[PDB]
Amino acid sequence: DPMVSKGEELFTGVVPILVELDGDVNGHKFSVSGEGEGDATYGKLTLKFICTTGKLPVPWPTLVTTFLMCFARYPDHMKQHDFFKSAMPEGYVQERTIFFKDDGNYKTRAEVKFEGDTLVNRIELKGIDFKEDGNILGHKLEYNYNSHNVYIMADKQKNGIKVNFKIRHNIEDGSVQLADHYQQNTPIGDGPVLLPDNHYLSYQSALSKDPNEKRDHMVLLEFVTAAGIT
Numbered sequence: 001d002p003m004v005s006k007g008e009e010l011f012t013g014v015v016p017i018l019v020e021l022d023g024d025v026n027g028h029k030f031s032v033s034g035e036g037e038g039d040a041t042y043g044k045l046t047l048k049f050i051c052t053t054g055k056l057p058v059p060w061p062t063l064v065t066t067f068l069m070c071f072a073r074y075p076d077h078m079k080q081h082d083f084f085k086s087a088m089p090e091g092y093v094q095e096r097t098i099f100f101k102d103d104g105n106y107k108t109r110a111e112v113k114f115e116g117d118t119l120v121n122r123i124e125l126k127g128i129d130f131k132e133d134g135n136i137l138g139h140k141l142e143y144n145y146n147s148h149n150v151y152i153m154a155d156k157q158k159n160g161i162k163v164n165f166k167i168r169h170n171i172e173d174g175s176v177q178l179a180d181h182y183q184q185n186t187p188i189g190d191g192p193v194l195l196p197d198n199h200y201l202s203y204q205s206a207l208s209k210d211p212n213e214k215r216d217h218m219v220l221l222e223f224v225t226a227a228g229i230t
Contacts, residue, residue: 003194007085011040011070016118017047019067025127026104026137028057034067036220038119040085043073043224051216058127059141060218061169064205065098065181066108068121069150072201072224081196081229083152083161083185089114090189092160101178104130113188135169135177142170145205149228154195160186161196199228 019034036047045068049060056063070084084092091113098106110123130137146168155162163183168176187193206221 004079010088011085014039018118019121021123021125023125025058026130030057038071040071045071045222047220049218056216058136059139061141061145062136066123072226074226078226078229081199083194083196086194087187092185092187094185096181096183099180100136103134103136104128135171140172141177142172143207145207147204150201152196153198155184158186199226201226
């Protein structure tokens with residue numbers, strides 16, 4: 001299938017990634033740059049993010065979902081369902097509203113596309129209605145991350161997809177902070193795309209620190225596999 005070939009030739013081995021985020025949460029401004037690589041064959045991403053404006057005013061874990069679905073490993077029998085690679089190289093827009101239960105919300109707009117050989121994710125994030133002393137602006141979330149599934153459906157009227165899911169962030173006391181994610185994606189180009197049957201992406205994420213890094217930062221290792229179509 002030459003549409004499937006075009007995504008395969010773009011993603012084949014290890015692809016460099018660049019992430020750039022401009023953020024304002026309750027008027028707390030901040031920027032983040034990330035670098036790393038992805039290997040869609042294995043669904044594997046390795047990334048290091050740096051707050052280049054000093055201290056990050058929200059917990060790193062709250063930005064994980066915002067900081068690359070085209071690196072998912074789609075099993076061979078599911079290749080016709082991979083919207084994200086099909087939109088490449090021109091790329092797609094990924095927009096979310098993330099509602100933190102009993103607290104504020106993030107609204108994100110991102111463009112995911114190639115710039116040369118590099119796969120780039122440029123993001124603007126706005127957060128509003130946060131509590132200054134809540135779990136997010138009060139930094140009460142644990143530095144770790146649970147596995148979750150992401151359910152994808154076609155958004156046929158818009159030639160894209162819509163995506164809904166819940167993230168549970170562990171709070172320092174043992175409880176959880178729910179972040180209910182609403183997402184839509186649309187191609188940037190006028191080229192055709194693969195619209196998928198309902199399915200999900202299964203995510204695993206591990207957060208760590210670079211022991212030689214003095215800046216505020218997050219190292220992220222993520223594996224992502226599509227499933228849910230026999």
